[PDB]
Amino acid sequence: HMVIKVEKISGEQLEVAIASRDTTLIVDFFATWCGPCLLLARELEQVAEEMDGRVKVVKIDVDENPDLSNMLRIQGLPTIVIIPKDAGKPALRTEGFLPAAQIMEIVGQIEAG
Numbered sequence: 101h102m103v104i105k106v107e108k109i110s111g112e113q114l115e116v117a118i119a120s121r122d123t124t125l126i127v128d129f130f131a132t133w134c135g136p137c138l139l140l141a142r143e144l145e146q147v148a149e150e151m152d153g154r155v156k157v158v159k160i161d162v163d164e165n166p167d168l169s170n171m172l173r174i175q176g177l178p179t180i181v182i183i184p185k186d187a188g189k190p191a192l193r194t195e196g197f198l199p200a201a202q203i204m205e206i207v208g209q210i211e212a213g
Contacts, residue, residue: 105145105148105149105152105157106128106141106144106145106148106157106158106159107156107157107158107159108158108159108160108161109158109159109160110160110164110165111160111165111167111168113158114127114158114160114168117156117158118183121156121183121185122185123153123154123155123156123185124154124155124156124182124183124184124185124207124210124211125155125156125158125182125183126144126147126155126156126157126158126180126181126182126183126203126207127158127159127160127180127181127182127183128140128141128144128157128158128159128160128178128179128180129159129160129162129169129172129174129177129178129179129180129181130159130160130161130162130177130178131161131162131163131177132161132163134177134178136177136178136196136197137177137178139197140178140180140197140198141159143197143198143199143200143203144157144159144200144203145157146200147200147203147204147207150200150204151204151207154207154211155207162174162177175195176195176196177195178195178196178197179193179194179195180192180193180194180195180198180203181193182206182207182210184210184213189210189213192206192210
């Protein structure tokens, strides 16, 4: 006996994760060859740990999801989309590396809306 947070998902998985969300949702659109994406994935794991139960972080490989990446017009990597828990509180979309502290401030400001 032994015991066992940034989940890689697919386009179809993201559809429900968006419609079924209880918390703020952070979606990281990334590619495996992209430096800044690699670094951002580390910050996101820190965000997902330090705010466990306040956010769910998911990542989506654009190369594996070319349809969805075109549908959203993903132009720069990484692309981060933060969807607040409740409708009305509007979403945020940004491009480029963001330190975990900045990500946490953003989620915090969305919580007090």
